[PDB]
Design a protein around this ligand. Structure first.
Ligand code: NI
Length: 142
DNA sequence: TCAGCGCATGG
DNA sequence: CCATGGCTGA
């Protein structure tokens, strides 16, 4: 079992690893959006949308106005509905193949949800900080 | 390759 | 004020 450690950077992925869907939802929330804005909205979403089954069948207009202050409301809204639907339906392995999930959300999955972390090469800053911090203190862990 | 989605905040 | 905080469809 992998179970990624918590860093000083405190990425939201650090507490979302045990729920691949929730982590992947967080990545979507972080597209062209600061963590300061996105993260609190993520929680208000998660309380009203705890599962991929709940988000699968849902009113995409009803998530949209919740994503309003962030921007990209109906874009993400219809995207999440499909992704959550695509989540519980298809067979995947690596998450990229799911709609709305590109390289970033995949690198997050590969690092946090499984142990590829040594192999994975990050793009995003936050991920790269965590990844570089890993190679340093990993011997002090396991 | 690339427009396009989108509001908030910092420079 | 005009930058900047991923991904798809095409
Ligand atoms: Ni995808």
């Amino acid at each position: 079992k992998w179970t990624p450690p918590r860093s000083p950077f405190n990425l939201v992925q650090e507490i979302l690893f045990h729920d691949p869907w929730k982590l992947l939802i967080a990545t979507i929330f972080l597209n062209r959006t600061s963590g300061k804005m996105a993260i609190p909205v993520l929680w208000e979403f998660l309380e009203k949308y705890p599962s991929a089954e709940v988000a699968r069948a849902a009113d995409w207009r009803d998530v949209s106005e919740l994503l309003k202050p962030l921007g990209l409301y109906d874009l993400r809204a219809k995207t999440i509905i499909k992704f959550s639907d695509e989540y519980l339906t298809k067979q995947w392995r690596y998450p990229i193949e799911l709609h709305g999930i590109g390289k970033y959300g995949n690198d997050s999955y590969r690092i946090f949800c499984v142990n590829e972390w040594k192999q994975v090469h990050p793009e995003d800053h936050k991920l790269n900080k965590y990844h570089d911090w890993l190679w340093e203190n990993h011997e002090k862990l396991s």
